[PDB]
Amino acid sequence: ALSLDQRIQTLAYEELNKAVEYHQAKAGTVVVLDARTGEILALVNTPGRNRAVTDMIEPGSVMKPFPIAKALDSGKVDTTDTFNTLPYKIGPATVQDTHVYPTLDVRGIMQKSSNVGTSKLSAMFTPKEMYDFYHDLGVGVRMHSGFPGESAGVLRNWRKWRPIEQATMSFGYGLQLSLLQLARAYTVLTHDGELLPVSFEKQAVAPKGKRVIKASTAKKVRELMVSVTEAGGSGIAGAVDGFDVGAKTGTARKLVNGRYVDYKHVATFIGFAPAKNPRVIVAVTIDEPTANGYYSGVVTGPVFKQVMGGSLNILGVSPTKPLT
Numbered sequence: 001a002l003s004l005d006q007r008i009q010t011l012a013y014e015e016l017n018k019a020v021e022y023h024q025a026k027a028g029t030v031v032v033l034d035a036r037t038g039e040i041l042a043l044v045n046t047p048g049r050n051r052a053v054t055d056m057i058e059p060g061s062v063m064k065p066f067p068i069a070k071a072l073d074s075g076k077v078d079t080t081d082t083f084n085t086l087p088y089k090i091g092p093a094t095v096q097d098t099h100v101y102p103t104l105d106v107r108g109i110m111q112k113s114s115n116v117g118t119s120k121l122s123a124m125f126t127p128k129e130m131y132d133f134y135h136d137l138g139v140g141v142r143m144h145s146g147f148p149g150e151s152a153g154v155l156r157n158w159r160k161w162r163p164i165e166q167a168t169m170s171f172g173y174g175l176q177l178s179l180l181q182l183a184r185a186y187t188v189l190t191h192d193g194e195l196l197p198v199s200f201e202k203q204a205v206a207p208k209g210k211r212v213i214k215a216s217t218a219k220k221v222r223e224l225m226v227s228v229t230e231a232g233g234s235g236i237a238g239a240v241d242g243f244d245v246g247a248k249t250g251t252a253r254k255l256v257n258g259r260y261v262d263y264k265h266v267a268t269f270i271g272f273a274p275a276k277n278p279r280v281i282v283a284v285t286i287d288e289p290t291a292n293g294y295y296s297g298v299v300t301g302p303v304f305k306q307v308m309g310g311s312l313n314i315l316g317v318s319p320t321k322p323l324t
């Protein structure tokens with residue numbers, strides 16, 4: 001009566017262990033969810049605690065689809081709109097990207113992973129609006145998944161936010177999610193705008209979602225997220241032959257003494273396929289790779305590719321386009 005698919009569980013375990021060994025990393029996790037039910041199809045960690053559920057991290061760039069979705073859902077932003085994406089200051093803090101683009105449209109913000117552009121979309125809303133949105137995604141909220149030691153994550157009350165915090169939260173710092181919570185939040189994108197519960201028991205009754213965005217918004221965001229895995233995108237390593245994949249890469253500096261350091265990273269990669277009508281969500285995080293690169297695309301992308309490609313094959317889903 002578990003929902004886990006043992007063939008997916010095996011595949012995820014093998015691919016994760018190979019990536020952690022190759023990159024000489026400290027730890028990692030893979031989660032596979034059913035994109036329309038929230039059932040856990042696989043959940044694996046490197047040896048030790050169930051980090052997928054016990055440990056909260058700053059999501060970094062994999063948070064970006066959500067402020068984007070909210071902006072579009074509000075009707076205040078259109079996908080074709082352009083934004084000033086030059087680095088800027090809020091008090092003494094800087095908001096900047098790893099490459100300077102003077103301007104980007106929404107597709108650009110997503111494809112290139114612009115911290116600046118994301119922060120400009122968030123800035124159109126009040127602290128209370130953005131908090132309510134993050135809360136509605138499950139940030140800071142207990143899933144009651146069935147696992148012991150389940151982290152609620154952290155979402156600071158909006159009454160306490162400084163202007164810099166609203167900005168950094170939009171691109172994934174100053175709030176914290178477990179990987180399972182993060183995979184759950186992506187059900188808003190895959191299940192036509194409603195957040196699903198997560199469970200590791202086979203479902204007998206249709207889960208009731210909570211409406212977070214319109215189905216039309218969800219569909220538009222999934223189309224934008226295909227750019228991440230196509231040429232020009234940060235997540236091209238996660239492309240799966242025969243499918244369109246919606247995804248988002250994240251690489252985050254870690255905190256050492258409450259200071260961000262530039263020699264220690266967490267790499268995350270999350271996506272879904274087939275992009276137009278997804279069957280599965282695959283989420284991958286690898287903590288502190290020390291060899292053979294540290295960016296999401298190079299560290300977690302190949303794991304995502306193998307697990308997603310393998311999962312769709314195991315579940316009997318045909319390629320939507322010819323192989324190559």
Ligand SMILES: *C(=O)[C@@H](NC(=O)[C@H](NC(=O)N1CCN(CC)C(=O)C1=O)c1ccccc1)[C@@H]1N[C@@H](C(=O)O)C(C)(C)S1
Pocket residue numbers: 060061062094095096097098112113115168173234249250251252253254260295296297
């Ligand atoms: C997404 O994850 C994004 N990553 C970064 O911008 C990342 N930035 C940070 O770690 N920080 C630390 C925290 N603060 C203060 C709150 C920041 O402003 C901040 O930006 C980073 C990581 C490594 C090197 C440079 C910057 C961009 N998306 C990833 C990705 O893999 O998609 C890029 C590497 C393309 S940048």
